[PDB]
Design a protein around this ligand. Structure first.
Ligand code: SF4
Ligand code: SF4
Ligand SMILES: [Mg+2]
Ligand SMILES: [Mg+2]
Ligand SMILES: [Mg+2]
Ligand SMILES: [Mg+2]
Ligand SMILES: [Mg+2]
Ligand SMILES: [Mg+2]
Lengths: 368, 53, 333, 333, 368, 53
């Protein structure tokens, strides 16, 4: 069952071809991926220890929970309080990692601590099920996530309107991957090759990433997450660099369609609108976020409450270098807090809290 | 985005029973209507997002 | 300063508490052999041409009943195993129970039944006990202490360079099963715990290659395999190379661990033993183990090396290399 | 059927649970000497010209700190005393702790400090341990197991007709003090607990009249003096006459017990030992005891008789006669 | 400090005089005391084992908690519920033993179980203190007890009016001793001598018991509670019987005044009114109880609520012989449940629950 | 009616500090106004009911 994609022989071969190609390479080639799941593949399998000194793999901002603005997390919290006072208790669902994400004003966990009803769920369906089991209350799901996660949200919003659920709301903090890559391009982040996130591609297909190679000539390679997927993509990128080629190779063709997945596309489009959005520790990226259209404003928990989120909320604790880690400009180990005051159990920054955070992945796997 | 693949063993409307190597879980097929038993899908947060070819 | 759930999760954080408080506040910690400072599976006390192995273990597993076993089978299995990895034959058990006001008499009876069935399998008698009842809504806590006799005691610092590293069975069955049971994850064939005494497994190997060739042992319970290995490496000051492709893992365990997002290497095992043996006896030990009912799935996973002393190096399936980091404590899927 | 607070109060109700469930469900209960069935302060295991005494005890006292001692001094004192009344010299202690999530690190440190100070007084080392942490709001539970060596083990069934009955000190100090501390009752001179190891007291008597003349012993802890005596009578199948006027009781204890409406005979003692000695050695034992720091207040309270076998007869101060009934469990003032 | 009253020599002497007097006695003399504290003295010191076969000491209904009607206990409970529904939570105080007293509809403990605020106190002051610490709530004390306990209640009612407390109420179930003795006389309870309760006497003095000797010629002896108090009183009664004397001897003169204690008398009179009252398992005794006068009806929790207590509530569980025990006609051991299904920890009847109950005293002390 | 005797050691209005052999407790003197230090009283439910002569 796809064993080849995990095959040691297949890997030892790819590693050799890669090595061969780099021996005759000048300078240094830097490949960047933008999906924590890929960073997990790379780090979990020790792929970096198999690469030639002149070939580097850097992790971009491929972690939706990490980049969620603290202003939005605080807002959601200010609304929980704003309801407890209006006598309207709310049931808040969030992902396990997001649940513990820090902000200068506390996490959703510190909230639970204050007696609020915050619940960890694994998907939007869980939230849906909670909205039907608790009719006497309003259930809201702080919804972050890239396209791959936006779709299941849009899909659930279709099954919510038909049923006419009224206690099914969500705080949208969805983000788009492609725009983030283009902002990183215009800002100097160095890399001659891209490893596009397989599953985000499954949704927007190969077509969604083309607009980048055409406008910047950067070779891209949609890849899966098995170890040989990443090794194949590295080889395929090294060669397009050496040959001067600048196109997109769909190495994850077994799961990705050129057009992608139309159902989800429209499903998302029917409910979400692209807008300018802030990325925690990164800045405000143009047309990089998704918010509910005026027609479905009834599903946005912010359409039922107006809170004043204090200004100048710092994005990170002093000493945290998660912003640079997210840009592929810094390694977790470059950080002084890494593995000291900052660990998965007692995290200082968001990169260590998230399951797809680069810092957590490095810590969890003992990078060498 | 754990994205683990499974073999669909039962389809019942927008719900399916996926088998992840001796471990079954129910999955929404909203984004993969064409899904049918015997198929292999990628599951993200309880939803099927694509079929493996 | 407050005690956190992790200070008792058997990982790095708990090691901090032991190093920053417990071992640091207690000053009298030895009776002529391996003592509290060694943090071994048990302590030893020279008593003639022999040595008495002493150990105690608290059990607070929830729920009290789970696929494959219960807090009762676990209490007996844990103490017997801790004596066994020391190279000692179980002599007697002491059972202390702290019951919550309101527990169902049938629950206590059922737990006692399991403890007894488990005890007879060794066999080992429960010669003394104690019973406390609290109003605290705790259900039940089972603390079991045990004494054993070892002709040649084994410690976590006996590992030598060139030695082979073996495990008696699949890794992650207890921890994962109990987790999958929490999240309601079902199965084709139910994933059960492996909780069980494994004295016979250790005895078999020793009775096949001799105690002199069993350089180290440890039941990889809290924090799992990685933790147990990291402990042996540190105390033996040796390095440990493990080949991921040789570590026995059930398909159900792999699958569930993935969905849970937790490595089966960091979760507790309740029916396994890690054994570091003399390089020229690894195969006999492996086979001696394979010949037992609880060791059918044994396997040589690696060897003791001179480099990376105090660390555990893992050679991934594709040939990559990385460290097998000792978890910070209790997993969170 | 539900477990009640009394099923663990050390009285008659707990004896019911042990007889109707525990001893009834466990089938393997002996290692060559005194076993679980004997319900003695500990078990014995023949090991050469010697015998290993094994015992375990759970501690759940609240509050963790009280006048005269703490759960830490109590944990060490209790296990050492249980080994001592068996006629065994403390060899080593095993310490298991089940800590509640959120406890103040300073509390754990303070408890550990007391355990250590107490341990050095014996002296006895703590060679092994275990640490668990639960979310349950329990603060802390300390379970201590201990092993000792006895040349000539003593049991609760050694009492002989004509033998004298002694206690090493005043009765009711621990139990009452802790109660008076609950109700906020103040004092001129604070009423403190007596919790303390008393191996030296037992050793002194034996080293004065020989182990062959110490026919029985028991630390009267849960359920107090009456319970301990009733236990000796039953297991020795002898009768026990006690003279109320000879039982040492502090004025503060009498006064507080009265106001609390509870007999100091039914409350736990944590620093005392009951000893049944050969009639022609009672005075030497008494004096040998009086010569110790913890036995200054010792006293011969009665004698073993042939009538009323299995019961404890009490001769009141005015000369009346009545039975000293073993309490049903925990007192309620 | 009164050591003589506990002196072994003093006792051995009294026991001898008693023995001497009984050797020359025909038939059998039966002395009855009506105070659980005396039964405790007798039983605790093994006095009965010191008496001549023809001299018996029987315990009368000297236990206020035992005789409190189940109708009153149920009422108090029906009022706790009646308030939880009227949104008015009440704080109920009761004595430790009364707290666990059984009724066919549960105890105050089973109530606490249902989430109600029931609190154990040692005296009425505790209740007073609770009424001032909890102004936002109504504090009520189920008040049973004989004169000795009525006084502290009346005294606290004086300090309550002056302060003008409004959340200080009590359910009166106070009873009078003398009337009970006279009802037992008219009903055949056999005894040629009475040992009047020292402390109830301290309140109503020797004068309070005279009306009984004059109307029935029964010799009485106000006694203390030390062992020699009871032994002295037994001797003093045996002689008044043999000599045909019929008067009242105040053996407890050190603590009792002929007139008694006027302060308390008026203190009680100022608030309480003698009325007909029922005695659990005994029947309705005329002018044997005390209820608040119409002027202080504001202190009676029943003046703020009207509950319908179901009829025909059985006084005791089947098999319980506490009624006969209370009459001095039965010993606890005559009961089949005694020490079997009925113990202080799991009591079947009220005589075993109460601290002054004869059954509890017999059980607690292992009578022989 | 435990009725234990104690020696009054402090009187302060309707409140007194009674000593029951090394154990002190506060007692109401409402039913024994004349009470004064040095006196011995019988205490029932936190109240002084009489003085011992
Ligand atoms: S380790 Fe922590 S603190 Fe350093 S950047 Fe990564 S999360 Fe920020
Ligand atoms: S023992 Fe129980 S059941 Fe028998 S009369 Fe006394 S209280 Fe009633
Ligand atoms: Mg171990
Ligand atoms: Mg262990
Ligand atoms: Mg070991
Ligand atoms: Mg004992
Ligand atoms: Mg003990
Ligand atoms: Mg003994």
């Amino acid at each position: 069952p796809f064993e080849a994609y995990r095959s040691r022989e297949v890997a030892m071969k790819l590693v050799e071809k890669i090595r061969e190609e780099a021996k005759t390479l000048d300078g240094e080639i830097r490949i960047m991926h933008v999906c924590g799941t890929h960073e997990d593949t790379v780090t979990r399998h020790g792929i970096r220890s198999l690469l030639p000194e002149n070939v580097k793999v850097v992790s971009g901002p491929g972690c939706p929970v990490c980049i969620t603005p603290v202003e939005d997390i605080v807002a959601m919290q200010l609304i929980m309080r704003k309801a407890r006072e209006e006598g309207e208790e709310i049931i808040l669902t969030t992902f396990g990692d997001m649940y513990k994400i820090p902000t200068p004003m506390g996490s959703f966990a510190d909230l639970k601590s204050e007696g609020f009803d915050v619940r960890i769920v694994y998907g939007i369906f869980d939230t849906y099920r909670i909205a039907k089991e608790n009719p006497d209350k309003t259930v809201v799901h702080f919804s972050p996530g890239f396209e791959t996660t936006t779709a299941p949200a849009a899909g659930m919003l279709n099954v919510a309107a038909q049923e006419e659920l009224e206690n099914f709301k969500i705080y949208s903090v969805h983000r788009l991957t492609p725009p983030a890559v283009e902002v990183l391009l215009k800002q100097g982040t160095v890399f001659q090759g891209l490893i596009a996130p397989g599953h985000v591609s499954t949704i927007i297909g190969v077509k969604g990433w083309e607009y980048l190679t055409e406008k910047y000539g950067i070779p891209q390679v949609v890849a899966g997450f098995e170890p040989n997927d990443v090794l194949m993509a590295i080889l395929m990128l090294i060669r397009m660099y050496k040959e001067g080629e600048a196109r997109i190779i769909n190495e994850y063709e077994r799961a990705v369609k050129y057009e992608g997945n139309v159902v989800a596309q429209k499903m998302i489009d029917k409910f979400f609108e692209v807008v300018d959005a802030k990325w925690r520790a990164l800045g405000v990226f143009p047309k990089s976020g998704l918010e509910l259209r005026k027609e479905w404003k009834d599903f946005e928990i912010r359409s039922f409450y107006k809170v004043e989120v204090p200004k100048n909320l710092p994005d990170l604790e002093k000493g945290c270098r998660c912003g640079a880690v997210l840009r592929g400009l810094a390694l977790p180990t470059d950080c002084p807090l890494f593995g000291k005051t900052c660990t998965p159990r007692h995290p200082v920054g968001p990169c260590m809290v998230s399951y797809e955070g680069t810092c957590q992945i490095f810590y969890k796997y003992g990078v060498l | 985005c754990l994205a683990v693949p499974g073999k669909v063993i039962e389809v019942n409307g927008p719900v399916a029973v996926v088998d992840f190597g001796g471990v079954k879980r129910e999955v929404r097929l909203d984004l993969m209507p064409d899904t049918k038993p015997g198929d292999w899908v990628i599951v993200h947060t309880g939803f099927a997002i694509e079929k493996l070819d | 300063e407050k005690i956190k759930l992790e200070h008792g999760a058997g990982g790095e954080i708990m090691e901090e508490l032991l190093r920053d408080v417990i071992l640091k506040t207690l000053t009298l910690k030895s009776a002529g052999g391996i003592g509290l400072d060694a943090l071994d599976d048990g302590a030893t006390i020279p008593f003639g041409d022999k040595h008495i192995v002493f150990t105690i273990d608290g059990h607070t597993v929830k729920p009290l009943f789970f696929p494959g076993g219960d807090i009762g089978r676990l209490a007996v299995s844990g103490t017997v195993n801790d004596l066994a990895v020391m190279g000692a034959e179980p002599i007697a058990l002491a059972n202390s129970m702290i019951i919550g006001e309101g527990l169902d008499m049938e629950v206590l009876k059922r737990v006692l039944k399991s403890m007894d069935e488990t005890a007879r399998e060794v066999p080992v008698p429960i010669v003394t006990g104690d019973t406390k009842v609290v109003e605290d809504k705790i259900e039940m806590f089972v603390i079991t202490a045990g004494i054993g006799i070892a002709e040649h005691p084994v410690s976590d610092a006996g590992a030598k360079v060139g030695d082979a590293v073996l495990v008696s069975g699949t890794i992650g069955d207890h921890g994962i099963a109990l987790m999958s049971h929490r999240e309601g994850i079902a199965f084709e064939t139910e994933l059960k715990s492996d909780v069980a005494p494994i004295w016979d497994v250790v005895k078999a190997v020793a009775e096949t290659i001799g105690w002199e060739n069993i350089h180290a042992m440890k039941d990889p319970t809290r924090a799992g395999l990685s933790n147990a290995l990291n402990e042996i490496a540190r105390k033996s000051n040796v390095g440990i190379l493990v080949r991921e492709a040789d570590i026995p893992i059930r398909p159900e365990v792999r699958a569930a661990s993935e969905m849970l997002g937790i490595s089966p290497y960091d979760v507790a095992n309740e029916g396994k033993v890690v054994m570091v043996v003399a390089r020229e006896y690894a195969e006999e030990a492996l086979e001696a183990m394979r010949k037992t009912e609880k060791g059918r799935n044994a396997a040589i996973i690696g060897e003791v090396i001179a480099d990376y002393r105090g660390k555990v190096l893992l050679e991934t399936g594709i040939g990559g290399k990385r460290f097998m980091e000792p978890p910070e404590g209790d997993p969170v899927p």
